[PDB]
Design a protein around this ligand. Sequence first.
Ligand SMILES: CN[C@@H]1CCCN(c2cccnn2)C1
Length: 166
Amino acid sequence: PKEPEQLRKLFIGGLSFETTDESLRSHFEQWGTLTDCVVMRDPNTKRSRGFGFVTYATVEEVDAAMNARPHKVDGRVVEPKRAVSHLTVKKIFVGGIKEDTEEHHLRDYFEQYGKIEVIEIMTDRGSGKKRGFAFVTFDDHDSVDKIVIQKYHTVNGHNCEVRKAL
Ligand SMILES: CN[C@@H]1CCCN(c2cccnn2)C1
């Protein structure tokens, strides 16, 4: 069936106050079918609040829209983000990797979510032994947002716990 609607929405911040439901839709329809598209406005003045949201038919369409950033909508670069599960960060904690998980295990898996800048496999300050967790830093927050909404992460045969970090 259909992916949950929450996972198909993009919050668009930084809109030009002249962007309308129609111009936001015409822009974002380039990357998929939009089932919803709304500019948020003041209830009394009708003046734009400078943000809005679009809902795609599928998660792959959300991905396509995010991969097409930066988006310049009505002359202004906007800020799309997936809906809250916003804690906008570029780093994840990866736990449950035990002592046999290496850098290449984490890189080969996580590189398909985004461009990796740092992998830090955590070791004991006294003994140097691996502690069984790591941090991965990406160049952009959407990688992290995709990662943390998955129910499961399997890396090196381990079922891992993944959370946003700082
Ligand atoms: C072994 N438990 C670790 C130690 C410190 C890192 N940590 C987290 C968890 C979520 C986000 N950032 N860091 C928990």
